[model samples]
Target chain A: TEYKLVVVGAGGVGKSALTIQLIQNHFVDEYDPTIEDSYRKQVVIDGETCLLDILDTAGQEEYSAMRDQYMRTGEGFLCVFAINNTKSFEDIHHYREQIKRVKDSEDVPMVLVGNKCDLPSRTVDTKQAQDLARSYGIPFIETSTKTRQGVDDAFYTLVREIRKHKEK
Target chain B: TEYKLVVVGAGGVGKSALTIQLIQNHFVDEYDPTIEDSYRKQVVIDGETCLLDILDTAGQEEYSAMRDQYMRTGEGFLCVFAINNTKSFEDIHHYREQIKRVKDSEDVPMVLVGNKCDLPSRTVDTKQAQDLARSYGIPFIETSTKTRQGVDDAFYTLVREIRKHKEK
Candidate 1:
């Protein structure tokens, strides 16, 4: 199955950083750009070959009018925020709200990602991120683009979330 | 109208302090406790007389089972977080989720409050809290128990939220 995945978050929060990490480490021959930088990568999850059709916001989330178009195309979203940045973590609710608003659903396929966890200047704690994700009733993944930690797991978790919503 | 207001948050976010500030400054006659310290304060908002039946959590939100009882009685909730405490700010989503779970409503009468505005050690930004509240489609208020800033506005806003929900 091809999962329409989108990475959305505030600026400088590793949206594109993690996006590049995912495809660079895990890619297949059959790749195409849906809109210039939108990449399609085949990866194995739970012994199933799945194509992740990714559309990252790349700061386009700052543009509200443009967001509605791509936000609609996403089957799942990775709401990325840097662990070192408090503003990014607090801004998750805003991004989450937009996804729910555009989709018009309370439960959407999403993973609240605390990226840049490898940094020592972490302001947003693990517990803090986990608590917020729990409230949203969605999965949470803390990733490090530099260390490549949780890059695949982040995408995989959203796929599972998408599948979970599909079952409902 | 008599509003059953509940104040809930993580510990030390001035739940009871702000609750006291409201009554000590702007209370009227006719008071009783539904449970010990629960207060009934008569105050005029927008020139309309109303009774605010407020119950401060006193760190009771940490106890999940205890939360269901009071959260049920609340016509509106003031989910408070100290400006200096990031954990308290992050924890609002948990309290918010619990309230929605017990009440079982997509749209609940609630206000996101950031207390301790007088402090110089402010960590959570005004913009951060406002953005989160805006996403929730609720009002936001910043208060200072020490300076008595926004004391009445917080409670009154919740009263308005309760009224707004009634109109829906």
Candidate 2:
């Protein structure tokens, strides 16, 4: 199975940290012209072999006006935020809504993630993230790239979500 | 923490099944006058002790008079439906909308549960349920009382949602 996944967030929320964390710390192929970073990886989830094509939108613009194109490019998305930054958390709502609007379907395969959990002074509460994810009817996970906690689970859960989306 | 939880669903959708599956095979406390089946259990979630007072509206009558009262008391809700019945799935929207209306908050703590998932014939698509839950910004889970699959997770997740609600 091949999953086109997008890692999207406001700047500096570790969109690259998460994408690279799942891709063995290096790019697997040629970089894309539009996306700041792109990578491919092979993994197994629930005993099924899977290929992940990840689009990491970390840096720059021109991408802004073309988000309609960006949102359409991925089958599933990782809507991310940093625990220390409340604005990032709030920005996730708009990102997710935009994806739903672009997809024209509320049933998009997605995961709401809170990144940088290793930080001691977290502005966002874990339970708040949990509740937000719960309301979205999507999975919520906390990740710290520095500690590598829950990085794989975040991606794998998105794949599982896509599988559910497909099964339905 | 003491959580006053409510299980609301359409008739014959295994509201009792999922409730009993989470409780100790029977009601722990004496019956409440209005609710058909009422249960209480003490359990630990994420190292925290919790007392769950579940008001299960299984059977019938006079209970309809105080639905607003019923909806008001519960801090968190388990808005349930059966997977094999499409109408029951559709009914969940009304149940949840009623909860939000009575609660007077869009950010109420709730879980959208699809029960009877062990059945061979499922009319409601899992992704549909997933996406609906997302639009409502709530958690969605599939549960089966017969196999007890995801039964505990359903309630545990609700309690966790309440925790988040309170934390925020």
Candidate 3:
């Protein structure tokens, strides 16, 4: 089975953190983006040891076209946003639409993950995230890499959704 | 007493949320940029009417020059970010530095506000906001317009600070 998971969003939204945690079960503090074009990697899943290939795209003005290209091919997507930034949440629609446009699939198995859920006093409304997800018919999850809250579930749930609706 | 609070942040960080709550005491589902330029309005504070004008700037590439202008004239500032977005918190330095450069005042009172705190499960980090404010020698607060949590205090505290430090 050819499986692909794409994490796309505005810069510094904890996409890398979420992705690393999903694959390697660790928080990746830094990632070396060699250029705007190439930042793809692969690893075995922590529990299952299942091989997974992931594409990490740089959110740059010059990489706009490349981002569009990757979105079209993404079989599974995790739209990561920092919970501390509301603008990123509002713009999730743009990413969601882009994923839909490229894949040409009505139910492409995407999830809305509000990363960094460790600080209760500094959170966006869960209802807002849920409402957005409900509107898009995607799963909603909150995660924090620091405390490891809902971190694993965010990715695993997306993976499960993707696999459950795999194309014949 | 005249109070000019500059709502500062990266694009889509919910500067408008704090602005709307301070002025209208209401939460808007989505705020289209109605105020093209920084809007100036008068509001009643401390049993006296003051020019509580707020200079709301657009995100990212659009409003740098105008933001600088507002920063120069702003007597007070509110560094706003979504509780779910880390990038918003990280960009606080840029906002503060811009305010400093334009206002040319080390003593101008400012506050760090983490907006969208109604969704605590989706938060990035509460302590980060407090740490940032401490580093800047300013007070920190968090609020959600939807929940009306810490809404009034966010603005009122800034007013109190500005009043306390007003030039003799």
lDDT of 3 by residue, A77-96 (tens): 88877788887787788778
What TM-score would each prediction reach against the true structure? 0.44, 0.43, 0.43
Q: Poorest 10 consecutive residues of model 3 chain B by lDDT? A: B57-66
Ranking by TM-score: 1, 3, 2
- Which of candidates 2 and 3 reaches a greater DockQ? 3
Alpha-carbon error at A161 in model 2, in Å?
59
Write the residue-wise lDDT of candidate 2 on B1-168 in tens digits.
456667778888886666656556422343455643454234444444443333333232111123555577678888888999998888788778888898898888899999999999989999999999999898999999888888888888888899888999
- Candidate with more favorable, higher lDDT: 1 or 3: 1
Flag the better candidate by lDDT, 2 or 3. Answer: 2
lDDT minimum window of 10 residues, candidate 1 chain A: A57-66
Docking class of 1: incorrect
Ranking by DockQ: 3, 1, 2
- DockQ of every predicted complex: 0.01, 0.01, 0.01
In terms of TM-score, which candidate is stronger, 1 or 2? 1
Native contacts conserved, per model: 0.00, 0.00, 0.00
Which runs in model 3 stand beyond 4 Å of their true positions? A1-168, B25-41, B52-64, B120-123
Collision count of model 1: 0
Evaluate candidate 2 and give its CAPRI docking class based on DockQ: incorrect
- Model 2 misses residue B126 by how many Å? 0.6
Q: Which of the numbered candidates is closest to the native, going by highest TM-score? A: 1
Q: Which stretches of candidate 1 lie over 4 Å from their true place?
A: A31-64, B1-168
